[PDB]
């Protein structure tokens, strides 16, 4: 099953905030699963995320034997093997091209106004069912209130 995970400020902007809570949610959901990423998230991460196979969806070749470089969506998939779930962690372009094959979304809705270049693709309500939502306040550690939600494609 293909699943997307993303943190969204208002307007579903993905790109400011300091959310340790969002990061332990991200970790708990991708640990021990393949994670499909875009070349820029790669360069911004800079090294393999531990505990996951890293597969990079890029047009030019890789320069890193530590991960899997894939030229397309179907090769992404194929590179993953026989696992119950594949996590799409981002790009905007990546999320856009995987949406149509996704069955689950894991979103962090951060109450925060921002001016960014990228958006999460628009998913359609009559298409997903919200099976989970959990609301949190800003705190000693997390600068903004946030909510965790999971949607399954109905
Ligand atoms: Cl760990
Ligand atoms: Cl949300
Ligand atoms: Cl919500």
From Swiss-Prot:
Name the UniProt key words of this record, in alphabetical order.
Antibiotic resistance, Methotrexate resistance, NADP, One-carbon metabolism, Oxidoreductase, Trimethoprim resistance
Provide one Gene Ontology cellular component.
Answer: cytosol
| Biological or metabolic pathway of the protein | Cofactor biosynthesis; tetrahydrofolate biosynthesis; 5,6,7,8-tetrahydrofolate from 7,8-dihydrofolate: step 1/1
Q: What is its EC number?
A: 1.5.1.3
* Miscellaneous: The strain K12 sequence is shown. Strain B [RT500] is resistant to 500 micrograms per milliliter of trimethoprim.
The task this protein performs is described as: Key enzyme in folate metabolism. Catalyzes an essential reaction for de novo glycine and purine synthesis, and for DNA precursor synthesis.
Could you identify this protein by its name? Answer: Dihydrofolate reductase
Organism annotation: Escherichia coli (strain K12)
Q: Which gene encodes it?
A: folA
């Amino acid at each position: 099953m293909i699943s997307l995970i993303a943190a969204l400020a208002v307007d579903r902007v993905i790109g400011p905030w300091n959310l340790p809570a969002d990061l332990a949610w991200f970790k708990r959901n991708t640990l021990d699963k393949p994670v499909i990423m875009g070349r820029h998230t790669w360069e911004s991460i800079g090294r393999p995320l531990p505990g996951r196979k890293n597969i990079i969806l890029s047009s030019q070749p890789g320069t890193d034997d530590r991960v899997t470089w894939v030229k397309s969506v179907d090769e992404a998939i194929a590179a993953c093997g026989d696992v119950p779930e594949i996590m799409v962690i981002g790009g905007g372009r990546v999320y856009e091209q995987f949406l149509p094959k996704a069955q689950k979304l894991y979103l962090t809705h951060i109450d925060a106004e921002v001016e960014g270049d990228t958006h999460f693709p628009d998913y359609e309500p009559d298409d997903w069912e919200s099976v989970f939502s959990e609301f949190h306040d800003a705190d000693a550690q997390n600068s903004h209130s946030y909510c965790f939600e999971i949607l399954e494609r109905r």
